Amino acid sequence: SATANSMNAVKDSLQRGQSTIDVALAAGDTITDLLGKMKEKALAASDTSLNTASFNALKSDFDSLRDQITKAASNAKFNGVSIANGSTAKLTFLANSDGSGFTVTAKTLTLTGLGLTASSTFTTAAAAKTMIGTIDTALQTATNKLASLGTSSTGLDTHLTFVG
Amino acid sequence: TLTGLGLTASSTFTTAAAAKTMIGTIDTALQTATNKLASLGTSSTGLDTHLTFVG
Amino acid sequence: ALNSINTNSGALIALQNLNSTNAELTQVQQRINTGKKIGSAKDNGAIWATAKNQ
Amino acid sequence: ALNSINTNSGALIALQNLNSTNAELTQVQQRINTGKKIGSAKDNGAIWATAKNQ
Amino acid sequence: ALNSINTNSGALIALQNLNSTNAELTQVQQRINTGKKIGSAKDNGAIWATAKNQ
Amino acid sequence: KLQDSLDAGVGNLVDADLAKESAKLQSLQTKQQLGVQALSIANSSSSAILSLF
Amino acid sequence: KLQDSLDAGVGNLVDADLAKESAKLQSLQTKQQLGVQALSIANSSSSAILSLF
């Protein structure tokens, strides 16, 4: 009977993990939209038929979107814990009454976790032509990270049904 | 404001040569004004996206 | 037991089956609302990621 | 909870999806009204500024 | 089954018949729009190729 | 044309077929009502024993 | 001619394609009605529990 009663804490832990991943996925929608817009900026800036003022305008938009990524990744927290802001390497949720864990690997969504830096930018059309492929890699790795978090959330839900 | 655009409350031209220079001055003023408004519009879109996330 | 007043195992199984039906209903409501069978990374991560990049 | 009377998490998600549809509808109404896909600095600041100067 | 709540075979057949009608409607819309009964290689490859060369 | 085909392909990947969801919705609502009724039948098993005492 | 080409270029940069917006408008109006219906279905979940009491 005591073993059966302690499963309530296991269920509470699994639901907490699902909430943490929900907040990370909400931040990831913002980040993937921002990365698609930045790819459009670098693609437009790589054209050499632009004059200097148009190129500078595209570069300024690119840098502002890059800062919004940092804002979105830093706010992806659920009651002080995060699986996506880079502050920890993994979270471990309860799997059974003995205290065995259900690990979820952290998927960093900050600029450094995406392969970028706080100073990433382009100053010439050739640098923008390179930034196209850089942002392509960043968007690809971000969607792979969010896909792993979604599979982890479905695994937590299936384990919660089994524990009940 | 006029000082934020690179102009002054007394900006004017008194000769054809001064007007020929003022052409480029006003060009710079319009360029910097459109860049400023573009940054404000990007900030407004960022506030809206953050409001959706907060909800 | 067979004629127990403390434990209703049949009610526990009936509750589990009702919860299964409620979860299916929640899934169908999400599909009707978004118009998507794969609306998030939770539905199918690989196809969701492919569709995002495309 | 699973059979809660205090919290309707499915209704919260349905409200979020309805708000998404309403925001898309507002965007399309602005395009029909102005005839512009980029009508202000809020739509796309760089292209809006380029078009203004031109 | 005959009185099943899990499987609606009649609804599956009705869905198939509605899809057939929708495909016919799409074909007629393409004909009205292009003015052509053979507008692409998908409609009839041999006659389309003959008409192209001519 | 390439942009239109990429958008139609995304729609093939993720869009729901709503005519099929309408059938699933109606049958699931009936199943939920029957499940509430079955749970109500299971709840009443203890009351049968009161007759013996 | 240069003035006309600058004005046509501004139009290429910012103008909407209204024939495409008409399709988006109709589909979005249908989506809004379905979203109201889905929210109405979600609102009614609590009423199912009243039957058990």
PDB file of all heavy atoms in Angstrom, chain A residues 5-41:
ATOM      1  N   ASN A   5       0.920   4.208  -2.843  1.00  0.00           N
ATOM      2  CA  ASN A   5       0.734   5.622  -2.532  1.00  0.00           C
ATOM      3  C   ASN A   5       1.887   6.476  -3.032  1.00  0.00           C
ATOM      4  O   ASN A   5       1.681   7.639  -3.383  1.00  0.00           O
ATOM      5  CB  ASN A   5       0.564   5.847  -1.034  1.00  0.00           C
ATOM      6  CG  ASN A   5      -0.736   5.316  -0.501  1.00  0.00           C
ATOM      7  OD1 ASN A   5      -1.710   5.180  -1.228  1.00  0.00           O
ATOM      8  ND2 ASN A   5      -0.763   5.027   0.784  1.00  0.00           N
ATOM      9  N   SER A   6       3.098   5.930  -3.084  1.00  0.00           N
ATOM     10  CA  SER A   6       4.214   6.763  -3.514  1.00  0.00           C
ATOM     11  C   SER A   6       4.235   7.025  -5.020  1.00  0.00           C
ATOM     12  O   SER A   6       4.985   7.892  -5.460  1.00  0.00           O
ATOM     13  CB  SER A   6       5.540   6.152  -3.066  1.00  0.00           C
ATOM     14  OG  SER A   6       5.778   4.919  -3.690  1.00  0.00           O
ATOM     15  N   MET A   7       3.423   6.328  -5.814  1.00  0.00           N
ATOM     16  CA  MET A   7       3.319   6.626  -7.239  1.00  0.00           C
ATOM     17  C   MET A   7       2.717   7.995  -7.529  1.00  0.00           C
ATOM     18  O   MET A   7       2.875   8.499  -8.645  1.00  0.00           O
ATOM     19  CB  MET A   7       2.510   5.551  -7.954  1.00  0.00           C
ATOM     20  CG  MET A   7       2.992   4.156  -7.699  1.00  0.00           C
ATOM     21  SD  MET A   7       4.543   3.900  -8.556  1.00  0.00           S
ATOM     22  CE  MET A   7       4.850   2.199  -8.171  1.00  0.00           C
ATOM     23  N   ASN A   8       2.019   8.603  -6.570  1.00  0.00           N
ATOM     24  CA  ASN A   8       1.512   9.950  -6.790  1.00  0.00           C
ATOM     25  C   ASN A   8       2.649  10.947  -7.002  1.00  0.00           C
ATOM     26  O   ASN A   8       2.556  11.833  -7.859  1.00  0.00           O
ATOM     27  CB  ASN A   8       0.624  10.366  -5.618  1.00  0.00           C
ATOM     28  CG  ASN A   8      -0.662   9.568  -5.547  1.00  0.00           C
ATOM     29  OD1 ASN A   8      -1.198   9.150  -6.560  1.00  0.00           O
ATOM     30  ND2 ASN A   8      -1.155   9.348  -4.345  1.00  0.00           N
ATOM     31  N   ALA A   9       3.754  10.787  -6.269  1.00  0.00           N
ATOM     32  CA  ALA A   9       4.914  11.645  -6.483  1.00  0.00           C
ATOM     33  C   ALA A   9       5.570  11.399  -7.837  1.00  0.00           C
ATOM     34  O   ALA A   9       6.040  12.345  -8.478  1.00  0.00           O
ATOM     35  CB  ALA A   9       5.924  11.451  -5.355  1.00  0.00           C
ATOM     36  N   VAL A  10       5.572  10.152  -8.305  1.00  0.00           N
ATOM     37  CA  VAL A  10       6.122   9.847  -9.621  1.00  0.00           C
ATOM     38  C   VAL A  10       5.297  10.521 -10.709  1.00  0.00           C
ATOM     39  O   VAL A  10       5.842  11.103 -11.658  1.00  0.00           O
ATOM     40  CB  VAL A  10       6.194   8.319  -9.820  1.00  0.00           C
ATOM     41  CG1 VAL A  10       6.757   7.971 -11.175  1.00  0.00           C
ATOM     42  CG2 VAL A  10       7.018   7.676  -8.729  1.00  0.00           C
ATOM     43  N   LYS A  11       3.972  10.476 -10.572  1.00  0.00           N
ATOM     44  CA  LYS A  11       3.116  11.143 -11.545  1.00  0.00           C
ATOM     45  C   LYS A  11       3.315  12.651 -11.524  1.00  0.00           C
ATOM     46  O   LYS A  11       3.346  13.292 -12.582  1.00  0.00           O
ATOM     47  CB  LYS A  11       1.655  10.799 -11.282  1.00  0.00           C
ATOM     48  CG  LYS A  11       1.305   9.361 -11.504  1.00  0.00           C
ATOM     49  CD  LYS A  11       0.117   8.983 -10.669  1.00  0.00           C
ATOM     50  CE  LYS A  11      -0.905   8.264 -11.484  1.00  0.00           C
ATOM     51  NZ  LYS A  11      -2.193   8.219 -10.770  1.00  0.00           N
ATOM     52  N   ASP A  12       3.495  13.227 -10.334  1.00  0.00           N
ATOM     53  CA  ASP A  12       3.739  14.661 -10.245  1.00  0.00           C
ATOM     54  C   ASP A  12       5.022  15.043 -10.973  1.00  0.00           C
ATOM     55  O   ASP A  12       5.061  16.037 -11.706  1.00  0.00           O
ATOM     56  CB  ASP A  12       3.828  15.077  -8.784  1.00  0.00           C
ATOM     57  CG  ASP A  12       2.498  15.463  -8.206  1.00  0.00           C
ATOM     58  OD1 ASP A  12       1.570  15.762  -8.982  1.00  0.00           O
ATOM     59  OD2 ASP A  12       2.365  15.452  -6.967  1.00  0.00           O
ATOM     60  N   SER A  13       6.065  14.230 -10.816  1.00  0.00           N
ATOM     61  CA  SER A  13       7.330  14.504 -11.483  1.00  0.00           C
ATOM     62  C   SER A  13       7.205  14.415 -13.002  1.00  0.00           C
ATOM     63  O   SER A  13       7.729  15.272 -13.725  1.00  0.00           O
ATOM     64  CB  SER A  13       8.387  13.533 -10.967  1.00  0.00           C
ATOM     65  OG  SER A  13       9.670  13.897 -11.393  1.00  0.00           O
ATOM     66  N   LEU A  14       6.514  13.398 -13.508  1.00  0.00           N
ATOM     67  CA  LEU A  14       6.384  13.275 -14.956  1.00  0.00           C
ATOM     68  C   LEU A  14       5.577  14.429 -15.552  1.00  0.00           C
ATOM     69  O   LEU A  14       5.898  14.927 -16.640  1.00  0.00           O
ATOM     70  CB  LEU A  14       5.763  11.927 -15.310  1.00  0.00           C
ATOM     71  CG  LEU A  14       6.520  10.675 -14.869  1.00  0.00           C
ATOM     72  CD1 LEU A  14       5.615   9.475 -14.860  1.00  0.00           C
ATOM     73  CD2 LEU A  14       7.713  10.423 -15.751  1.00  0.00           C
ATOM     74  N   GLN A  15       4.545  14.892 -14.841  1.00  0.00           N
ATOM     75  CA  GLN A  15       3.795  16.045 -15.327  1.00  0.00           C
ATOM     76  C   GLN A  15       4.635  17.320 -15.296  1.00  0.00           C
ATOM     77  O   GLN A  15       4.527  18.163 -16.195  1.00  0.00           O
ATOM     78  CB  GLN A  15       2.513  16.206 -14.514  1.00  0.00           C
ATOM     79  CG  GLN A  15       1.588  15.019 -14.651  1.00  0.00           C
ATOM     80  CD  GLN A  15       0.334  15.144 -13.836  1.00  0.00           C
ATOM     81  OE1 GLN A  15       0.371  15.154 -12.612  1.00  0.00           O
ATOM     82  NE2 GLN A  15      -0.791  15.234 -14.511  1.00  0.00           N
ATOM     83  N   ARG A  16       5.502  17.458 -14.294  1.00  0.00           N
ATOM     84  CA  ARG A  16       6.405  18.600 -14.250  1.00  0.00           C
ATOM     85  C   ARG A  16       7.357  18.595 -15.441  1.00  0.00           C
ATOM     86  O   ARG A  16       7.637  19.645 -16.034  1.00  0.00           O
ATOM     87  CB  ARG A  16       7.182  18.572 -12.937  1.00  0.00           C
ATOM     88  CG  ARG A  16       7.826  19.858 -12.533  1.00  0.00           C
ATOM     89  CD  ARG A  16       8.193  19.858 -11.058  1.00  0.00           C
ATOM     90  NE  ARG A  16       8.498  18.533 -10.536  1.00  0.00           N
ATOM     91  CZ  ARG A  16       7.877  17.959  -9.513  1.00  0.00           C
ATOM     92  NH1 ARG A  16       6.847  18.532  -8.917  1.00  0.00           N
ATOM     93  NH2 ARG A  16       8.292  16.774  -9.088  1.00  0.00           N
ATOM     94  N   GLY A  17       7.824  17.411 -15.833  1.00  0.00           N
ATOM     95  CA  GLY A  17       8.694  17.334 -16.991  1.00  0.00           C
ATOM     96  C   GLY A  17       7.980  17.690 -18.278  1.00  0.00           C
ATOM     97  O   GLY A  17       8.544  18.365 -19.147  1.00  0.00           O
ATOM     98  N   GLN A  18       6.721  17.277 -18.401  1.00  0.00           N
ATOM     99  CA  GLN A  18       5.960  17.651 -19.586  1.00  0.00           C
ATOM    100  C   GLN A  18       5.740  19.162 -19.651  1.00  0.00           C
ATOM    101  O   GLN A  18       5.810  19.756 -20.730  1.00  0.00           O
ATOM    102  CB  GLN A  18       4.631  16.897 -19.613  1.00  0.00           C
ATOM    103  CG  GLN A  18       4.728  15.508 -20.216  1.00  0.00           C
ATOM    104  CD  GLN A  18       3.470  14.684 -20.035  1.00  0.00           C
ATOM    105  OE1 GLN A  18       3.315  13.984 -19.048  1.00  0.00           O
ATOM    106  NE2 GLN A  18       2.585  14.737 -21.007  1.00  0.00           N
ATOM    107  N   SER A  19       5.533  19.810 -18.500  1.00  0.00           N
ATOM    108  CA  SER A  19       5.377  21.266 -18.494  1.00  0.00           C
ATOM    109  C   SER A  19       6.665  21.984 -18.895  1.00  0.00           C
ATOM    110  O   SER A  19       6.632  22.967 -19.650  1.00  0.00           O
ATOM    111  CB  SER A  19       4.925  21.746 -17.120  1.00  0.00           C
ATOM    112  OG  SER A  19       3.630  21.304 -16.806  1.00  0.00           O
ATOM    113  N   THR A  20       7.807  21.504 -18.400  1.00  0.00           N
ATOM    114  CA  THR A  20       9.084  22.107 -18.775  1.00  0.00           C
ATOM    115  C   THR A  20       9.331  22.000 -20.275  1.00  0.00           C
ATOM    116  O   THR A  20       9.738  22.977 -20.926  1.00  0.00           O
ATOM    117  CB  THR A  20      10.214  21.441 -17.992  1.00  0.00           C
ATOM    118  OG1 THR A  20       9.869  21.402 -16.609  1.00  0.00           O
ATOM    119  CG2 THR A  20      11.523  22.180 -18.166  1.00  0.00           C
ATOM    120  N   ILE A  21       9.053  20.832 -20.853  1.00  0.00           N
ATOM    121  CA  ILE A  21       9.224  20.697 -22.292  1.00  0.00           C
ATOM    122  C   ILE A  21       8.221  21.559 -23.060  1.00  0.00           C
ATOM    123  O   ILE A  21       8.546  22.077 -24.130  1.00  0.00           O
ATOM    124  CB  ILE A  21       9.149  19.213 -22.688  1.00  0.00           C
ATOM    125  CG1 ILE A  21      10.339  18.462 -22.095  1.00  0.00           C
ATOM    126  CG2 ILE A  21       9.122  19.052 -24.195  1.00  0.00           C
ATOM    127  CD1 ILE A  21      10.327  16.996 -22.343  1.00  0.00           C
ATOM    128  N   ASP A  22       7.006  21.752 -22.534  1.00  0.00           N
ATOM    129  CA  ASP A  22       6.051  22.625 -23.216  1.00  0.00           C
ATOM    130  C   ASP A  22       6.572  24.051 -23.305  1.00  0.00           C
ATOM    131  O   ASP A  22       6.447  24.704 -24.349  1.00  0.00           O
ATOM    132  CB  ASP A  22       4.701  22.622 -22.498  1.00  0.00           C
ATOM    133  CG  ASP A  22       3.789  21.500 -22.946  1.00  0.00           C
ATOM    134  OD1 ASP A  22       3.801  21.148 -24.140  1.00  0.00           O
ATOM    135  OD2 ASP A  22       3.032  20.978 -22.104  1.00  0.00           O
ATOM    136  N   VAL A  23       7.172  24.548 -22.224  1.00  0.00           N
ATOM    137  CA  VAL A  23       7.716  25.900 -22.279  1.00  0.00           C
ATOM    138  C   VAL A  23       8.875  25.977 -23.269  1.00  0.00           C
ATOM    139  O   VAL A  23       9.006  26.956 -24.021  1.00  0.00           O
ATOM    140  CB  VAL A  23       8.119  26.378 -20.871  1.00  0.00           C
ATOM    141  CG1 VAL A  23       8.768  27.733 -20.934  1.00  0.00           C
ATOM    142  CG2 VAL A  23       6.900  26.447 -19.980  1.00  0.00           C
ATOM    143  N   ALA A  24       9.703  24.931 -23.329  1.00  0.00           N
ATOM    144  CA  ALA A  24      10.799  24.955 -24.296  1.00  0.00           C
ATOM    145  C   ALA A  24      10.293  24.939 -25.738  1.00  0.00           C
ATOM    146  O   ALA A  24      10.855  25.616 -26.601  1.00  0.00           O
ATOM    147  CB  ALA A  24      11.748  23.790 -24.053  1.00  0.00           C
ATOM    148  N   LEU A  25       9.234  24.182 -26.023  1.00  0.00           N
ATOM    149  CA  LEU A  25       8.694  24.166 -27.379  1.00  0.00           C
ATOM    150  C   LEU A  25       8.054  25.497 -27.753  1.00  0.00           C
ATOM    151  O   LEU A  25       8.136  25.924 -28.915  1.00  0.00           O
ATOM    152  CB  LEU A  25       7.682  23.034 -27.530  1.00  0.00           C
ATOM    153  CG  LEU A  25       8.189  21.601 -27.390  1.00  0.00           C
ATOM    154  CD1 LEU A  25       7.027  20.641 -27.387  1.00  0.00           C
ATOM    155  CD2 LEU A  25       9.183  21.243 -28.476  1.00  0.00           C
ATOM    156  N   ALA A  26       7.430  26.171 -26.786  1.00  0.00           N
ATOM    157  CA  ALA A  26       6.898  27.497 -27.065  1.00  0.00           C
ATOM    158  C   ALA A  26       8.009  28.484 -27.395  1.00  0.00           C
ATOM    159  O   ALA A  26       7.854  29.318 -28.289  1.00  0.00           O
ATOM    160  CB  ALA A  26       6.067  27.997 -25.887  1.00  0.00           C
ATOM    161  N   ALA A  27       9.138  28.408 -26.690  1.00  0.00           N
ATOM    162  CA  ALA A  27      10.274  29.245 -27.072  1.00  0.00           C
ATOM    163  C   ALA A  27      10.858  28.843 -28.427  1.00  0.00           C
ATOM    164  O   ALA A  27      11.314  29.704 -29.190  1.00  0.00           O
ATOM    165  CB  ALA A  27      11.345  29.188 -25.992  1.00  0.00           C
ATOM    166  N   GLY A  28      10.817  27.554 -28.757  1.00  0.00           N
ATOM    167  CA  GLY A  28      11.402  27.098 -30.002  1.00  0.00           C
ATOM    168  C   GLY A  28      10.632  27.535 -31.227  1.00  0.00           C
ATOM    169  O   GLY A  28      11.218  27.725 -32.293  1.00  0.00           O
ATOM    170  N   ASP A  29       9.318  27.718 -31.095  1.00  0.00           N
ATOM    171  CA  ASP A  29       8.552  28.289 -32.203  1.00  0.00           C
ATOM    172  C   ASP A  29       9.040  29.695 -32.551  1.00  0.00           C
ATOM    173  O   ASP A  29       9.286  30.010 -33.728  1.00  0.00           O
ATOM    174  CB  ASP A  29       7.068  28.307 -31.849  1.00  0.00           C
ATOM    175  CG  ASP A  29       6.397  26.970 -32.084  1.00  0.00           C
ATOM    176  OD1 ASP A  29       6.877  26.200 -32.943  1.00  0.00           O
ATOM    177  OD2 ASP A  29       5.397  26.675 -31.402  1.00  0.00           O
ATOM    178  N   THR A  30       9.243  30.530 -31.531  1.00  0.00           N
ATOM    179  CA  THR A  30       9.809  31.857 -31.736  1.00  0.00           C
ATOM    180  C   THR A  30      11.184  31.782 -32.381  1.00  0.00           C
ATOM    181  O   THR A  30      11.484  32.528 -33.319  1.00  0.00           O
ATOM    182  CB  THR A  30       9.905  32.590 -30.398  1.00  0.00           C
ATOM    183  OG1 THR A  30       8.614  32.669 -29.794  1.00  0.00           O
ATOM    184  CG2 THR A  30      10.490  33.969 -30.567  1.00  0.00           C
ATOM    185  N   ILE A  31      12.030  30.874 -31.899  1.00  0.00           N
ATOM    186  CA  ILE A  31      13.401  30.862 -32.392  1.00  0.00           C
ATOM    187  C   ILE A  31      13.465  30.392 -33.845  1.00  0.00           C
ATOM    188  O   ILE A  31      14.211  30.958 -34.650  1.00  0.00           O
ATOM    189  CB  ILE A  31      14.307  30.039 -31.459  1.00  0.00           C
ATOM    190  CG1 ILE A  31      14.685  30.882 -30.242  1.00  0.00           C
ATOM    191  CG2 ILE A  31      15.560  29.607 -32.166  1.00  0.00           C
ATOM    192  CD1 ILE A  31      14.824  30.131 -28.968  1.00  0.00           C
ATOM    193  N   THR A  32      12.679  29.379 -34.219  1.00  0.00           N
ATOM    194  CA  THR A  32      12.708  28.939 -35.613  1.00  0.00           C
ATOM    195  C   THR A  32      12.127  29.987 -36.556  1.00  0.00           C
ATOM    196  O   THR A  32      12.635  30.155 -37.673  1.00  0.00           O
ATOM    197  CB  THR A  32      11.982  27.600 -35.796  1.00  0.00           C
ATOM    198  OG1 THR A  32      10.666  27.666 -35.250  1.00  0.00           O
ATOM    199  CG2 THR A  32      12.738  26.488 -35.117  1.00  0.00           C
ATOM    200  N   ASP A  33      11.111  30.741 -36.118  1.00  0.00           N
ATOM    201  CA  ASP A  33      10.628  31.835 -36.958  1.00  0.00           C
ATOM    202  C   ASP A  33      11.688  32.917 -37.135  1.00  0.00           C
ATOM    203  O   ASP A  33      11.891  33.429 -38.249  1.00  0.00           O
ATOM    204  CB  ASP A  33       9.356  32.432 -36.365  1.00  0.00           C
ATOM    205  CG  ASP A  33       8.163  31.520 -36.516  1.00  0.00           C
ATOM    206  OD1 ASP A  33       8.238  30.573 -37.323  1.00  0.00           O
ATOM    207  OD2 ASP A  33       7.151  31.736 -35.821  1.00  0.00           O
ATOM    208  N   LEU A  34      12.392  33.262 -36.054  1.00  0.00           N
ATOM    209  CA  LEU A  34      13.434  34.273 -36.153  1.00  0.00           C
ATOM    210  C   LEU A  34      14.560  33.821 -37.072  1.00  0.00           C
ATOM    211  O   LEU A  34      15.088  34.619 -37.850  1.00  0.00           O
ATOM    212  CB  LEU A  34      13.982  34.600 -34.767  1.00  0.00           C
ATOM    213  CG  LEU A  34      13.087  35.419 -33.840  1.00  0.00           C
ATOM    214  CD1 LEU A  34      13.580  35.337 -32.420  1.00  0.00           C
ATOM    215  CD2 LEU A  34      12.997  36.846 -34.298  1.00  0.00           C
ATOM    216  N   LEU A  35      14.929  32.544 -37.008  1.00  0.00           N
ATOM    217  CA  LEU A  35      15.994  32.045 -37.867  1.00  0.00           C
ATOM    218  C   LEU A  35      15.586  32.037 -39.333  1.00  0.00           C
ATOM    219  O   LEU A  35      16.415  32.322 -40.202  1.00  0.00           O
ATOM    220  CB  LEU A  35      16.420  30.646 -37.430  1.00  0.00           C
ATOM    221  CG  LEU A  35      17.257  30.544 -36.156  1.00  0.00           C
ATOM    222  CD1 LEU A  35      17.324  29.117 -35.683  1.00  0.00           C
ATOM    223  CD2 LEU A  35      18.642  31.115 -36.354  1.00  0.00           C
ATOM    224  N   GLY A  36      14.319  31.745 -39.634  1.00  0.00           N
ATOM    225  CA  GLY A  36      13.886  31.840 -41.017  1.00  0.00           C
ATOM    226  C   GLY A  36      13.936  33.261 -41.542  1.00  0.00           C
ATOM    227  O   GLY A  36      14.372  33.506 -42.675  1.00  0.00           O
ATOM    228  N   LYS A  37      13.561  34.227 -40.701  1.00  0.00           N
ATOM    229  CA  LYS A  37      13.673  35.620 -41.125  1.00  0.00           C
ATOM    230  C   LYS A  37      15.128  36.048 -41.311  1.00  0.00           C
ATOM    231  O   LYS A  37      15.441  36.803 -42.240  1.00  0.00           O
ATOM    232  CB  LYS A  37      12.965  36.527 -40.127  1.00  0.00           C
ATOM    233  CG  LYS A  37      11.537  36.815 -40.499  1.00  0.00           C
ATOM    234  CD  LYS A  37      10.644  36.862 -39.291  1.00  0.00           C
ATOM    235  CE  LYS A  37      10.544  38.264 -38.737  1.00  0.00           C
ATOM    236  NZ  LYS A  37      10.150  38.270 -37.300  1.00  0.00           N
ATOM    237  N   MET A  38      16.033  35.576 -40.453  1.00  0.00           N
ATOM    238  CA  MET A  38      17.441  35.924 -40.622  1.00  0.00           C
ATOM    239  C   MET A  38      18.031  35.315 -41.886  1.00  0.00           C
ATOM    240  O   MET A  38      18.867  35.939 -42.548  1.00  0.00           O
ATOM    241  CB  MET A  38      18.259  35.503 -39.404  1.00  0.00           C
ATOM    242  CG  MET A  38      17.947  36.255 -38.143  1.00  0.00           C
ATOM    243  SD  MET A  38      18.296  35.334 -36.649  1.00  0.00           S
ATOM    244  CE  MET A  38      20.035  35.669 -36.491  1.00  0.00           C
ATOM    245  N   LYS A  39      17.613  34.101 -42.242  1.00  0.00           N
ATOM    246  CA  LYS A  39      18.057  33.542 -43.511  1.00  0.00           C
ATOM    247  C   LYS A  39      17.577  34.384 -44.681  1.00  0.00           C
ATOM    248  O   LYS A  39      18.326  34.609 -45.635  1.00  0.00           O
ATOM    249  CB  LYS A  39      17.577  32.108 -43.675  1.00  0.00           C
ATOM    250  CG  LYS A  39      17.991  31.494 -44.994  1.00  0.00           C
ATOM    251  CD  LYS A  39      17.360  30.148 -45.200  1.00  0.00           C
ATOM    252  CE  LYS A  39      17.934  29.432 -46.406  1.00  0.00           C
ATOM    253  NZ  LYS A  39      17.711  30.178 -47.657  1.00  0.00           N
ATOM    254  N   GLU A  40      16.343  34.892 -44.614  1.00  0.00           N
ATOM    255  CA  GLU A  40      15.899  35.769 -45.695  1.00  0.00           C
ATOM    256  C   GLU A  40      16.709  37.062 -45.750  1.00  0.00           C
ATOM    257  O   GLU A  40      17.016  37.547 -46.843  1.00  0.00           O
ATOM    258  CB  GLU A  40      14.407  36.070 -45.565  1.00  0.00           C
ATOM    259  CG  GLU A  40      13.510  34.934 -46.010  1.00  0.00           C
ATOM    260  CD  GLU A  40      12.069  35.067 -45.522  1.00  0.00           C
ATOM    261  OE1 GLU A  40      11.312  35.872 -46.098  1.00  0.00           O
ATOM    262  OE2 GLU A  40      11.684  34.366 -44.566  1.00  0.00           O
ATOM    263  N   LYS A  41      17.116  37.594 -44.593  1.00  0.00           N
ATOM    264  CA  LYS A  41      17.947  38.799 -44.587  1.00  0.00           C
ATOM    265  C   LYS A  41      19.310  38.552 -45.230  1.00  0.00           C
ATOM    266  O   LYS A  41      19.762  39.342 -46.063  1.00  0.00           O
ATOM    267  CB  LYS A  41      18.134  39.328 -43.162  1.00  0.00           C
ATOM    268  CG  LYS A  41      16.889  39.820 -42.457  1.00  0.00           C
ATOM    269  CD  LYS A  41      16.339  41.059 -43.117  1.00  0.00           C
ATOM    270  CE  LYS A  41      14.874  41.293 -42.804  1.00  0.00           C
ATOM    271  NZ  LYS A  41      14.157  40.056 -42.449  1.00  0.00           N
TER     272      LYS A  41
END
